Enzyme design. Structure first.
Site, PDB file in Angstrom:
ATOM      1  N   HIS A 160       0.961  -0.947   0.025  1.00 15.77           N
ATOM      2  CA  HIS A 160      -0.005   0.141  -0.397  1.00 15.77           C
ATOM      3  C   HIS A 160       1.068   1.396   0.023  1.00 15.77           C
ATOM      4  CE1 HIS A 160      -3.054   2.557   1.604  1.00 15.77           C
ATOM      5  NE2 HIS A 160      -3.877   1.725   0.259  1.00 15.77           N
ATOM      6  N   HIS A 188      -1.846  10.317  -3.128  1.00 16.23           N
ATOM      7  CA  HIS A 188      -2.770  10.033  -2.462  1.00 16.23           C
ATOM      8  C   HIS A 188      -4.016  10.978  -1.786  1.00 16.23           C
ATOM      9  CE1 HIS A 188      -5.676   7.536  -0.300  1.00 16.23           C
ATOM     10  NE2 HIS A 188      -5.857   8.811   0.820  1.00 16.23           N
TER      11      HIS A 188
END
Ligand SMILES: [Ca+2]
Ligand code: NA
EC number: 3.1.4.46
Length: 258
Positions: free
Chosen positions: A13, A55
């Site tokens: 991730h 992100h």
């Protein structure tokens, strides 16, 4: 192969983001060394239309810059420090080499690893950054990556349907927030299966029954963001087929038992 339901996938991730500043080349390199199956990317578009990996829609959290990505040129973004924030946030994990790490473009990540990495890449609702999906697809084609080489993830059903009609052999995964997963039905999973190979729910909303239910539709199951060993074990025992984790080495160790 990579899309086999009987294969348990380690998705790093934002790279090895538990140890290295998220979404940097170093984070991905570290994930690779830690034997992650996939490196995971989020995309934003710059003012001059370039895809970078970040992100948040804003530069604030992970750089010494401020404001929306889409208000800044790539050239200015490439000047930013995308590593020092980590040393500040997690002083016990700080490393000198993290100072001055840069925001990578999608192009730079693909160029860095080529076919040597498998990519788990997020798209947005098509209205967020018009042409994002098409630019992504063209970038993947440039690096001759268009399976399991690339999986596209998104909260946006419309984005994944668009992808699936543009590139029918490009595996997609429907991301699900907690409340969505909480009220999941067989009908909805059956719908998902028509364009997606898997589902990616907030792991907190999972239990044995709905895990079994997702699995019953032949869907892959990759909950996020699973960082604690106890949770890794519980979810694997229930029958998930991989996880998004900030700690890919830990998950690599754990999944050997499943
Ligand atoms: Ca993510
Ligand atoms: Na900042």
């Amino acid at each position: 192969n990579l899309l086999s339901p009987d294969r348990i996938l380690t998705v790093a991730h934002r790279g090895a983001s538990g140890y290295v500043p998220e979404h940097t080349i170093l984070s991905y390199e570290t994930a690779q060394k830690m034997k992650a199956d996939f490196i995971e990317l989020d995309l934003q578009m710059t003012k001059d239309g370039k895809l970078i990996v970040m992100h948040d829609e804003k530069l604030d959290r992970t750089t010494n810059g401020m404001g929306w990505v889409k208000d800044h040129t790539l050239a200015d973004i490439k000047k930013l420090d995308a590593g020092s924030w980590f040393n500040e946030a997690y002083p016990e994990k700080a490393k000198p080499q993290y100072v001055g790490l840069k925001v990578p473009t999608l192009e730079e990540v693909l160029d860095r690893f080529g076919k040597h990495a498998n990519y788990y890449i997020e798209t947005k609702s098509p209205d967020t950054y018009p042409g994002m999906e098409e630019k992504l697809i063209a970038s993947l084609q440039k690096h001759k990556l268009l399976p399991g080489q690339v999986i596209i993830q998104s909260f946006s059903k419309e984005s994944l349907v668009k992808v699936h009609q543009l590139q029918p052999n490009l595996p997609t995964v429907q991301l699900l927030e907690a409340k969505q997963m909480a009220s999941m039905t067989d009908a909805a999973l059956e719908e998902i299966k028509t364009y997606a190979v898997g589902a990616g729910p907030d792991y907190k909303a999972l239990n044995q029954e709905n895990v079994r239910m997702i699995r019953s539709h032949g869907l892959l199951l990759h909950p996020y963001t699973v960082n604690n060993e106890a949770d890794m074990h519980r979810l694997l025992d229930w029958g998930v087929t991989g996880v998004f984790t900030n700690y890919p080495d830990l998950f690599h160790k754990v999944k050997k038992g499943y």
